[PDB]
From a paper:
We produced a C9L/M14L/M16V-triple mutant that successfully generated diffraction-quality holo-Fur crystals. The overall structure of holo-Fur was a homodimer with the same secondary structure as that of apo-Fur. Thus, the binding of two Mn2+ ions stabilized the hinge conformation and induced profound conformational changes of the DBD. Site 2 resides almost entirely in the DD, within the β3 and β5 strands and α5 helix.
In most bacteria, iron homeostasis is regulated primarily by the ferric uptake regulator (Fur). Fur, which was first discovered in Escherichia coli, is a global transcriptional regulator that directly controls the transcription of over 90 genes involved in iron uptake, storage and metabolism. Several holo-Fur structures have been solved, revealing a modular domain organization including an N-terminal DNA-binding domain (DBD) and a C-terminal dimerization domain (DD). In this study, we present six crystal structures of apo-Fur, holo-Fur, Fur in complex with the Fe2+ transport protein (feoAB1) operator and the P. aeruginosa (or E. coli) Fur box.
Residue numbers in the entry:
A (entry chain B), B (entry chain A): 1 to 134
The structure:
Amino acid sequence: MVSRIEQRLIDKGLKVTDQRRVIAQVLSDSADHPDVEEVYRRATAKDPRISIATVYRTVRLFEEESILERHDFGDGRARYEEAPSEHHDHLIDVNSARVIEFTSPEIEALQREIARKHGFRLVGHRLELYGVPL
Amino acid sequence: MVSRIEQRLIDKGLKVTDQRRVIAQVLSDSADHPDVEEVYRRATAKDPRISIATVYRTVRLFEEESILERHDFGDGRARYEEAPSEHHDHLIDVNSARVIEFTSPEIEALQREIARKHGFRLVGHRLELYGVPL
Ligand SMILES: [Mn+2]
Ligand SMILES: [Mn+2]
Ligand SMILES: [Mn+2]
Ligand SMILES: [Mn+2]
């Protein structure tokens, strides 16, 4: 098969050039929330004709198309992942910038109830935990 | 006879100029997490000699001195409040930008367990809820 991101591109009728295929594959493979520079090093290592400008343009395309989600965990560094098929939040090692995903149905339910008590429906939220190793 | 923020400047040995006093008063009085433009409008209504540049510099001074906390609820728009005595999180109306503060000891406990289970101690977190009125 083609990468998950390539398939999403086909679904939306966007052109799949050689270089876009490489970038889509890099991003589908990655689960570590790479920044644009990291996507670039991975992509250009596969196809050396890929420039950082093309990676910027391609990541913007994916973000515009809701294929990628972007995070800034505090340090102003944009980090990217596929639109997850399951909601999760993030715990970040403040020393190494390692990101861990977690889900807490209990917190999700508590958030929605807090919104309800205040007369609101929740349309979005951001939960980030900042940690140092025990 | 002084605002809470002016008291903090007194505790730090910092000169309270007339313009610092007005800006401190505006911020101590504000409960709506104002941006800098809004602080400016309120300060300049009290004393029309105060320029927008002075407001920006003074808010920056207060933030650097840990007298104010700065929030960016996702849009890049900096909003301010006195450094809170008690921890709270925020629910934001995505239509009006109105901010509601809340606490949830149950959520706070769950966050601690989540960090622990992944081998971390929590040094900080960010929880923002985005709502629309029911
Ligand atoms: Mn969540
Ligand atoms: Mn993620
Ligand atoms: Mn909290
Ligand atoms: Mn607050």
